[PDB]
Amino acid sequence: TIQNDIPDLYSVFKDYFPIGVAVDPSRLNDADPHAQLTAKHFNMLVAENAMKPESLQPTEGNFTFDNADKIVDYAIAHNMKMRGHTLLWHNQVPDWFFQDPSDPSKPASRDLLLQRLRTHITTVLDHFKTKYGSQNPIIGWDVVNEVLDDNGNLRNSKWLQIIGPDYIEKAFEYAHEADPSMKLFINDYNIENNGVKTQAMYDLVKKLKNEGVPINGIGMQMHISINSNIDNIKASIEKLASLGVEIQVTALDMNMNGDVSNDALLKQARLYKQLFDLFKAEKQYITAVVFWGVSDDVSWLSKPNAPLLFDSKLQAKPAYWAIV
Numbered sequence: 352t353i354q355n356d357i358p359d360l361y362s363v364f365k366d367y368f369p370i371g372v373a374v375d376p377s378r379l380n381d382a383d384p385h386a387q388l389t390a391k392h393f394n395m396l397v398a399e400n401a402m403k404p405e406s407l408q409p410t411e412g413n414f415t416f417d418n419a420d421k422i423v424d425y426a427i428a429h430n431m432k433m434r435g436h437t438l439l440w441h442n443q444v445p446d447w448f449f450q451d452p453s454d455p456s457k458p459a460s461r462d463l464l465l466q467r468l469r470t471h472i473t474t475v476l477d478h479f480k481t482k483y484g485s486q487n488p489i490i491g492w493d494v495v496n497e498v499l500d501d502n503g504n505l506r507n508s509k510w511l512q513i514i515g516p517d518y519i520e521k522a523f524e525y526a527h528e529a530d531p532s533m534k535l536f537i538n539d540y541n542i543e544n545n546g547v548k549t550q551a552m553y554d555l556v557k558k559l560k561n562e563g564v565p566i567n568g569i570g571m572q573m574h575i576s577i578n579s580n581i582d583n584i585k586a587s588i589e590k591l592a593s594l595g596v597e598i599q600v601t602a603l604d605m606n607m608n609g610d611v612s613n614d615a616l617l618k619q620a621r622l623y624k625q626l627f628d629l630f631k632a633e634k635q636y637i638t639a640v641v642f643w644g645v646s647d648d649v650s651w652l653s654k655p656n657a658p659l660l661f662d663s664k665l666q667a668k669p670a671y672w673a674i675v
């Protein structure tokens with residue numbers, strides 16, 4: 352049972368940016384405590400899995416939008432905005448995209464993979480626009496997800512192998528052409544550490560924007576840990592923001608490295624407070640902050656963990672109180 356009378360989390364940040372959460376379509380019923388926590392605390396929603404490539408086009412031409420639409424319907428019913436996650440990734444993407452259809456033992460050509468990418472992107476964006484029109488809550492999409500490797504080079508996924516380095520620019524071109532009203536993001540993890548990957552993201556976006564690629568923002572996943580350095584996060588935000596793009600914190604959670612003790616929860620509260628003070632200070636750049644999961648019991652991180660503001664019993668944790 353949730354605490355109904357404590358402050359609605361997103362309301363605390365009304366003068367800064369929307370506060371969202373990634374959800375599962377099976378946790379949206381009015382009688383479900385997870386759905387109650389969702390509607391109470393967040394004014395933005397993201398599909399944790401239902402809008403990924405495999406979740407939308409499992410086999411070629413066979414589009415499965417029911418779960419995604421259930422989430423969109425819920426966002427509309429609760430006056431929430433949404434982020435679309437994600438049009439291209441190297442995980443949760445079906446193998447058929449990369450296979451020659453006449454000989455599945457061989458790879459698709461650059462032109463065929465690009466055509467499939469264009470058809471996927473266009474169908475996905477046209478689906479939400481035609482079904483929901485002006486009521487479409489989605490304000491932007493993670494057009495590409497995790498395209499850098501941890502050394503800062505382009506990740507050598509099948510997209511890169513088959514097409515080459517311009518597959519990123521093409522994804523953005525296709526998305527922009529399908530729906531120019533959507534803000535287009537490049538999303539990634541570890542770019543908040545002010546290391547080689549942060550520099551590579553800055554370099555890549557600088558390059559693509561100078562070439563006219565329609566990138567509107569950079570999504571910083573923010574899968575931080577109890578040991579993360581706030582100074583590095585501030586420096587990363589400032590560096591990426593210098594490109595003149597929006598910054599969104601897209602998948603925030605805190606890895607406790609196995610320590611879920613009361614002492615650790617207090618340390619987590621101090622760190623989350625510092626993190627949100629930083630986000631508020633950078634409000635001129637940050638346009639959304641989204642948590643990757645509603646409560647600890649439904650977090651994607653393996654156990655034991657305590658990554659979010661609501662615990663495994665759906666109760667507000669010390670970090671929630673520290674922030675509000």
Ligand SMILES: O[C@@H]1[C@@H](O)[C@H](O[C@@H]2CO[C@@H](O[C@@H]3CO[C@H](O)[C@H](O)[C@H]3O)[C@H](O)[C@H]2O)OC[C@H]1O
Binds near residue numbers: 602
């Ligand atoms: O077995 C499969 C699971 O492994 C899968 O788990 C999801 C994996 O993707 C996570 O979201 C990513 C978290 O990291 C970054 O933020 C990415 O951008 C996200 O996409 C989900 O949280 C997990 O639920 O689910 C499907 C199942 O078949």
